[model samples]
Target: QTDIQSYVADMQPGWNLGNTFDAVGDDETAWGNPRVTRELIKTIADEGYKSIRIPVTWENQMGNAPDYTINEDFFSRVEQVIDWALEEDLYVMLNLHHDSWLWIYNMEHNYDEVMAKYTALWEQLSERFQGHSHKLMFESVNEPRFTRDWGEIQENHHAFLEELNTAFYHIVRESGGSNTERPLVLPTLETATSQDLLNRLHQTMKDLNDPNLIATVHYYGFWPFSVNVAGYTRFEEETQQDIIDTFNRVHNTFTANGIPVVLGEFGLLGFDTSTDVIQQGEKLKFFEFLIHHLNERDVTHMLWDNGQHLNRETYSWYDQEFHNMLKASWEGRSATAESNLIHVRDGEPIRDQDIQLHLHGNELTGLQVDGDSLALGEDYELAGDVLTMKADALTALMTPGELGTNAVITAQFNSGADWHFQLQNVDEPTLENTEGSTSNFAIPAHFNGDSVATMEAVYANGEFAGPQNWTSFKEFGYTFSPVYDKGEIVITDAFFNEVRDDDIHLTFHFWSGEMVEYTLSKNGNHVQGRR
Candidate 1:
């Protein structure tokens, strides 16, 4: 009575209700998200999302040893949330999230104890939800990390995951009613997309020979870019290729045959810090391209929200533009630009600025300011991929031309989210020489309506200095970061610890394409700077 492939396809483009149930704390709201409400479930369905992944961590509310009984109140609350989702007709994928680290990761050392709780929990879950609709899917675990040494998996680690998965498959299938045929999702070691791990998961599915089995993996993007480290400040060729290669591997390993693949969780890891961690334009491009490839490979992806993307309290999106971009990308491609900023120098005559648009086969219809359409020939002109904003239009938009963002203009296209560009009047930022020790070095800066992009450091001999010694451009938000509000650039201890007692040249690159030069002498613990 169940077609796994058809059911999985219908659950395309899902959202994760993160930080609410998955929070490892005293209670569901301990992680700062407001308690779930029926209205929130209704809002998710109304927003065009077909499925929701409610990650629940049960260990905190369960009794210890022997029975390992789950608290009645917590159990009923979880059921209430699931029932609400099902009422709204949303496919719900519930799983043992975060517990993978709490206790599951230590299974190798404490096999008897770990397996006891895991088996007992599943037995209860299988019996309780046995008669629910087929739309309710069970994922064995979320990002299962088997080894104590995180990020490094060994032979035993893979076997541990296989054993757990095999046990889960048997336990659920033996249960009666809809549980006998309910679609089950199994994750690779660490829920990674590596070929070796994928092959292992493939073998697990092959050995079981279950037609209703689904493979799951989580993609947070290439490590360096995902965490905004290693000087990967842009979603360029290397980053884009990472996505292409991952999807291709997922397709060849599972979906190419009969098994359906679900990207159980995906989003930039940098999002955990702040949305501005990655430039807006680059973030948009990443999602647009990532979603396009997922659709091509027939892979269903669930976005990991974590209370950052969607505001559960107000039932609104924190970034409406980003939400719209994802909503548009759910169906087709959306246009993006090289950069989302248009800098106009202060005390200078306005001049036309050229923006290269990546139409992605979509046509540029026109431009708009404050939701009012502007004349194509006068306000903007498009030639092939280049969009030229006339100087006259810029002048009118910034009538009382002042520093900072003077106007916001959007590029309209036939499809996708409108590309937004900010017109800002900026002057070259200035820095003052300051004195401090290697432990704490901060140069006073006068940003003057400009934002710093990245910082580069080099020794007097011209060799790269600080972390990632091969590259002069240090990672933003880690080694060095610009504090516009405080009017200073802090050089963290992480950067200073890596350098020797010598003179180093520093260059600050601004978002407006202006570079300011400075020099620092790091002798023993003493440090001094000069502009």
Candidate 2:
């Protein structure tokens, strides 16, 4: 699956005027300013931003009333901005931002009132902009974190979002406009930062049957360095790598799992002007790395602009150089595609083996084999013995290893190969023995009265030998002696030939508490003995 490139319009045009609800019932008189005019929309469009995200405080705009009607003038002002954005042929995203805590509190105790107002709010909003293009998306809510406990937060957030999502879908579908089929961005509880929250919310939304639904997650892994007012004093190379690796892991969860993701907010701030430049440079570098990685994975993202820096305020876009850096980074690469090559033997291709290689795209110019060179290209090919290609514009080379019946082949590319390429080896099996033996021998036998007892010899190699027999005599405390001529034992029992052959090894039986000596030939013949 491929991911589209995207961007955000953060902070509101006149963020310097402090439109935030620092105190309850604070007047939103500053929201109607004409700062974010059509020009700003055109500028973003010219700069190749695919989308604009307008975050509004719904509770602040609509007080806690049974009717819960948002002020018409304020609605008109918001609509005007949306119209300006739409005029530029850009995708516009509007959402209820920073209302999670308030909504949770109200829903906790006044469940009836909260649901009434919630459903009413969605109905009004859906009906108000029912005629907007499908490009205009509505995000259910922003990061819903209020409770510190993950479990409690998820439970509360999931409940609220489930209700809200269902309401939004129903209202939009019944609104009689493009919204019925428009894409809607749904957020997990507590800012969508936790995988647990995203997964839980995903389960809740599964029954909605909205094909255009996409999941939202915020990325600020290096928050201390990226967003702290007091800038990070120092960051080592490994620290930077750690940040990049962490972001990759976070982004991959959605992209690798076939879910759409949006990096809703990411930026850096500094307390002092002198540190701003350094911080901005670091932030831009981070963005460059993130955008490149996302591009390769085809994950969509957006930059969070607080809209306070057009004239170079503390963390706003006051510096042209800083803004230029952002522009250059954004325009550096529009999209990145990856490819992979696998080799296999006759009736056993390399694709059947596990081969992993990390290729640096921003480093190598081309891939090279034993002595052959191949230009870095988009398609991953496994021809004959050489594997060559450009994954995300980086050269990657692979070699096949000795194949075995139990061998497995797999490959992971840090930047280039397919999302995940794996080839497993499958082969037949054999058998073995579990016992040991000493030497080849024959079997022997002994007789008591007229009954014969035969003994067979077992060889060290797990094979059987022949058998022999013998007889015994009891008289004058006599024992049988071997007849040297016949290699057999003979016994004289009152002038009778009853002889026995005894072959034994002396040893102590630990369990039996006895010492015995006895012997037997390879055959099943045994000699009589007493211990």
Candidate 3:
């Protein structure tokens, strides 16, 4: 029932209904963006978008006595907004956001309590909308974190994240009904920026055994660029590379692997373009190029609309460019292709199979193939907004063993129409396996093909807050387990941590009392740890 990327791709360049529902005050209009209305959602759909992310911090309405009880009125509010979006055929994502308030951290000691609360929140939420359309989505948590470093305590934060990540999937599926097929969005480590972290996240997702979901990370992009100076902007080489790395991290971590990735939240937030006229023009250029760049990589992005630009009260943008930048690139142009890159596969004979490139502008004209004149009816056909090419016409240009050849496909829709794409040798545009257990839940490939489900959330810390709250989660990993023989703790048991698949032997040096030595056993081999 869940269509993977195409269903997600339809969301194309998406938008986020920010600073409203997720406001710290729990009041929709408290931070501005106007109380969400059917018209605002409708207007967004009218702008030609099929995707939007609604972030909510549900702590206030959640009841402690009932243990995870959410207010009916609060639940209704989320459902109502979603109803409005679904009516417009929009793909919507509802996530537990900025949930640090849940006391989500104390994992070194409160692991059971934290996971209990985490599972409870999703369990209630997932069950509440069990009958809704699969178009709706749920995100586990926004920016779930413990410590800044991966390994600050005896038990690393990464270890806790994986446990929570795997537990998230288990609790939701246990709720039953349409939720089994519901889409869920997952995030990476704190801030989730580096591809290193992306790979770490991707490794966890691939373990989900579902193709219906995607990997996501919040992006503010280059600090220099995104951190608006409220004046003219500067784009240099480092700035450009920073942008490329941002997209590449997603592409390699998910898209290249045939999975989808979402730029969960991104925008020119630092720019108060409302008052700065110069910020207005430059920010438009910044967004226009950024969206097009994302499109080229087949990445779906959402603008963090935290009120300022779009006045929800009037249901209109303070600046039309704010609306135009998101509508799609090739703005103000007639024959603009969504992307300058027209992807194609290599080593295949082009026949019977046709390539239908799409467009949205005045009228596609000046069609050129490899800089040579080609007859339209003979070589290809142009009808409506699609340009199609026959198999043999393209097959002629693909010469084997010459590695990959680049064919130039040029066209113009009308005057001032600027468009181009690199036609080169690469994997053909394909979504790989699309059908399977398509739950909307997403996880990063933990590593190779390892899954977090196979491991137990039985780990705890030895020294957090300097022995305070040392054991957070349930089922001690080393500190309280046999690994600790009063002073010497050995975490060589396979059940503790799988990533290392080794044993860790620890001893508190008697002479220096503060000094501790460790030896981690790997594949039955010992690897020591020194500080």
Candidate 4:
């Protein structure tokens, strides 16, 4: 009798319960009550909420020992609240929250010690809450992660979730209620608002075997207002749309995969304003849009609050007509729905899909298209369209012979005759050393030369093509005569006596040793000599 479709309105009831190991001690008398009483639960239940989610911290309740038992008084107090919610016929979800970080850090930095503690804690909790009805669902953990890197965060999240899910299975199976399967909710890592993180939830779902598992994500993208109370005065329309778009993309991915989604937490702050009525109405409108969006996608959400709002003189829930707006929006269906009037082209909807691209740090090194990978120093052709790129790993702006920021390398191709293609950050040579004394003496294939004495050539595309001779023979020079009839350019001295017969060597050295040595063959081709 697990209600998978039950849409619960969560109120983080026990906020006064501080995050500590000894939270339920004799000194901590205000643990179960968050300034919220039985009347507040009845008020929300009467307003059409099908359920309530109460988040509780159990770490402090369990004192140190092999006994590992929760204080009887704290246990009774939590049960009383659960009973109150059930008295109103509301589905209640009790979960372990805010204790994940302590466990995660211990597991990450000190595995052996934390594992024993975690296992013992769950065993005690399962044994203590064994008698609760199927209406009481158990949520595994909340917002699990230490860092944001994809690889690292994913590793820890997977480990913790696997452990928690295993514990839940054991607990439910052991506590038999007609063997009535109790629904358990699994929260995404750090409430996973990022699309990349949300897409990775499939891996998480693989480890979760129970049919009662509901995927959970939190909605708090409006961080500026939530974190800073000053955010209430400024309302940017585009910013709002961007936030919604991010949420929709995440929601679509989850729902499309046939997985049930629960928005674990969603709420805006009730800021004190001079124009309180107007501001409150605007805030409620924000919620209306948010709730409607979630409802259309069949996502159940919960609002964050305790019972402080009931004391309107001390707190401000009704400020700026907030209460009226919530009541109106909750009562009627807002005029928002999925539309199909727009053209759908090739499985992609034709909407305002102009993505504004920006680079975070430096220039992009390479790009991929249709699974074909291209390097930065090559030319690419796609459907008769040619694009070229030239990259130099050794060249930076501040070094000698460096390519400045504005420099570009040219590329030519078949689509257009003599097309001037440009590549960013190409080095422009400032000095020439043709004596074979320096590393830069090799002739570039692009330059064509004049005579046998000045004939300097290089291999291009696996064939001898260049007569890139030095103009001044005082240092080093070469030329070509019709690049020679045999397509071979001869290298000669300053007076044109053939140097080809002499021992001609081209050194390719790195660090200190010669990696490749090229020698002129009797036939005038530079052949690989030695390593």
Candidate 5:
């Protein structure tokens, strides 16, 4: 059970037996899928899914309070499904899916009691599954975020989840039998999709220090392409890279750090539920790319079906081409692995190689090596699309193993697709260090009266231009109202924070031949003629 990575690798290009066990209402059949015979699972394994995620909503069947006893029959059915998967030689993942017995998503208000059943449910599940072979796995929940809306994850929820997850880890680990070493899957809101949530997980996992655990995340790309629109939907080139960057972020943030991750659920939204004019072309492209990206990044992935893409009753695919697309990725035939790839050694320095950072402009706002944040002035220098590693700073970064096959370079462009890469040492340019403030012009103490801040200004051909203005202050936990008057700038609606000062501030671009923008927080008194 502890060889979580191997289990993950084998589970790549897996399948989710969705809408059956996790089905809400009176029974597993309430969701309307077939009764899940052994043949169904066996067919999935034969079709290509090396693993099967059998989601069970035990909360719906379990008794309340002191015992929190799971229905014996319901437990038997879940166990039967697990036995089928293991008998088929496929790895299995079992967990609490969409259930509300404890009001899970409302972590803020449920903390007082969530833990009461949290451990109890897991303890019961662990004890039951504890007898199974190592191939059977356990997941915490299915996108346990705010009710209905899976993406609106908040920071406070994280505090509760970290502790909730800690409790889960302990309960399962302590539950006797094979549970002591059984692999566990922990989750964050949106299945660890949010960067803040991922950061939260990095700490939680780092502290657990158990290689038997992994974090699971779900992916559906942009909602438009995944579910909504149907007539020839496309993930748009830019949007596609954003998903790619997200995968890399997960890798650098978790997988590369020795924590394995599972794409617990991922797939374009099933179109049969909405229309026959399904955009398989676009979906295939999306799946194909992530297949290799997930594989290369040391992460595992499973497709979400729920009797949508493939008919559960007949065990035949709804769209063979779509099926082929997913198969291609797992087979390593995707373009990402074969071409335009940035290869690096598992644990060596990415030698000097000119990485064509196809950025829009000087908006290289963020750069990360592996998961380590590189302070703009602290780690490297940037200008144009060219990034030069500061030798002195790079020296300290000495080729740590943290950089794996997908050792990442998460680059943030002020205006384009987030660019990322993997690197290793190579002989090329010595170095080119450009110096500029990565953050806002601080007002230390009243801007020093006549202080002149050396700045960055630029002009481009079409959409190309700089002297960037940053108002993305929310990530820093605060927003502000900037006042401008008499060639002076000040803040009035600002609450100060040192740890977040760099992000809570503001900046803007300039004018040469022409320029334009808008400001929502451009209201303040006494700084200008408005006083």
Candidate 6:
């Protein structure tokens, strides 16, 4: 059937089997994920994912340039995984993943060699899976880009990607079998969502005159917020507006005009297990809101899980709440709060606090602490979407409150995941003067049960002095980061590289509404700091 829209619609709420076959190392397990198993594929289907995108890198597994024959064992393993997904009744999208950068990036220069290799690779893949079920879809390339530079996509890059995409479409169709009419997904340059990139992709699709083509793009949220940089610490107006504008453009470009769109990869760029770039509540809000918009626009979206989102070994989510929010967002919007924190200053009179809620048409039915419901009039009051937490309840909750998290209050709504309030006691954090080279500079800190929201870096003359010089507030985990466990704040080499060898004024903004100032003077590669 040429009705590819319905076919891709069924592929909504997809999960990426990332970091396995997509690993750039010698083997699939080189990226720390265990070998792909039937159980894992079954688990993904059972978890309500209708589709899975298995990214495979063919560079290391394939032989020399002329033939570029795929290894038998490697090819069989990939087929086995794809077959398992198909058997589980899940739509599977397969793509040439990291190889896009390995050899494909040089396709502009090594046109003949790259085309032969690419053609050989796809000829084998399309011919092998020719008679296979139509549930298996082929993507042209994963984030295909020509230049090594991460700068602008020049006119030639667009032309180059369109040529590659056109080649892929012809290869799969003419290879003979179900692939003749197999649903093919094509990507914009770098799989980016920029207007010009989308326009280029749309023009390419129009030129191909194929009915089974689907436009694809990758969204890592707004640039500043995606990596926890430039003071965009929350899913505020600018970030939310970015989501709206981007999705609307995609919807109008393809989805509205009979062509289906697949958000091939969607997630925060700064998601790392070792260090949390964005706070949990903010992260949850971002996903909940973004997924709702994606669903509204009828875009089939996939979570970009690079071995961190879902545990390959245990078949469990790293963050259960995050998983819950994602599952809930597939169908409808979720309720969220302005802030997930209730900061109580240590040694100050406890005052009543009010937090605004983003209900999304859901009512806050109840509030509880430790599974016990709080009385409405005495403990708290809800007016519209604003919840006022009483001072007396705060006093009782923080009794003998330790420095950090004293209590967790759950706000239960009629729909979606329950929002949790992390009630914490706090005070101004102090950073000690320390000395180190530009290579390694960490300021000793006594955080006093507070978290660093953002950091402001400026020269002695008050000009911004960091990676993002346009803004005084530096990115969370890029230019500077608070290693809470290590009792220090790390100033990265990336930040120092942009700064002059002079006195730099640093203002640390904490979550508990406290700011601490410090000064650092740099000479050569050596640096000295003082409070």
Off by over 4 Å in 3: 149-155, 229-232, 272-278, 330-531
- Candidate scoring better on lDDT of 3 and 6: 6
Displacement of residue 173 (Cα, Å) in model 1 is 1.2
Please state the error at residue 443 of candidate 1 in Å: 3.8
By lDDT, the better pick of 2 and 6 is 6
Instruction: At residue 192, give the lDDT of candidate 2.
Output: 44
Show where candidate 6 strays beyond 4 Å.
Answer: 148-151, 272-275
Cα TM-score per model: 0.93, 0.54, 0.60, 0.53, 0.60, 0.95
In candidate 1, list every pair of residues with a backbone clash: none
Give lDDT tens digits, candidate 3, residues 477-509. 222222112222223233223323433333321
Per-residue alpha-carbon lDDT of candidate 2 for residues 292-335, written as tens digits (9 for 90 to 100): 65555555566655444442122235655445545544434211
Clashes of each: 0, 53, 33, 7, 10, 1
Cα lDDT of all candidates, in order? 0.89, 0.46, 0.59, 0.45, 0.59, 0.89
Kindly report the root-mean-square deviation of model 2 from the true structure over all alpha carbons. 29.0
**1-531 per-residue lDDT for model 1 (tens digits):** 247888899999899999988899888998999889999999999999999999999889889788899888888999999999999999999999989999999988999999889999899999889999989999998899976566578888998999899989899999979998899999999899899999999999999998889999999988777766656777889988999999899999998988899999999987887777777777888888999999998899899998998888799999998888899889989988888888888778888889888989999988889989999788888889999999999888874536788889988888777889988878889999999987788999988778877788999999999998878888777787787778899998989889998999998888888899999999888899998
**Most accurate candidate by TM-score:** 6
Clashes of 5: 10
> Candidate 6 residues 279-383, lDDT tens each?
888999999989999988999999999888888889988888889999989878789998889888888899999999989999899999999999999999999
Q: Candidate 4 has which clashing residue pairs, if any?
A: 21-60, 276-320, 277-320, 454-478, 454-479, 455-478, 455-479
The digit string of per-residue lDDT tens for model 5 on 317-365 reads 8766557556655655432111122433333444433344433123566
TM-score result, candidate 2? 0.54
lDDT of candidate 4 over 1-531, digit per residue (tens) = 224544232321111112212233342334443434576567667656666777666666766756557777776767777788778877777676655664544455666655666666656666666776666677777676654456646566566656665665576567676224766677766776677667656556666555656777876536443322222223346436755786677667766655677776655433221222112323444655665456566676665543333332233343323444344444333221111011112222222211111121112233332333444444322222222222232122113322222322222222111111112222211112223211112322211111111122223222322222331111112221112234332233322233333333432221111123234322333322211
For candidate 5, report its TM-score.
0.60
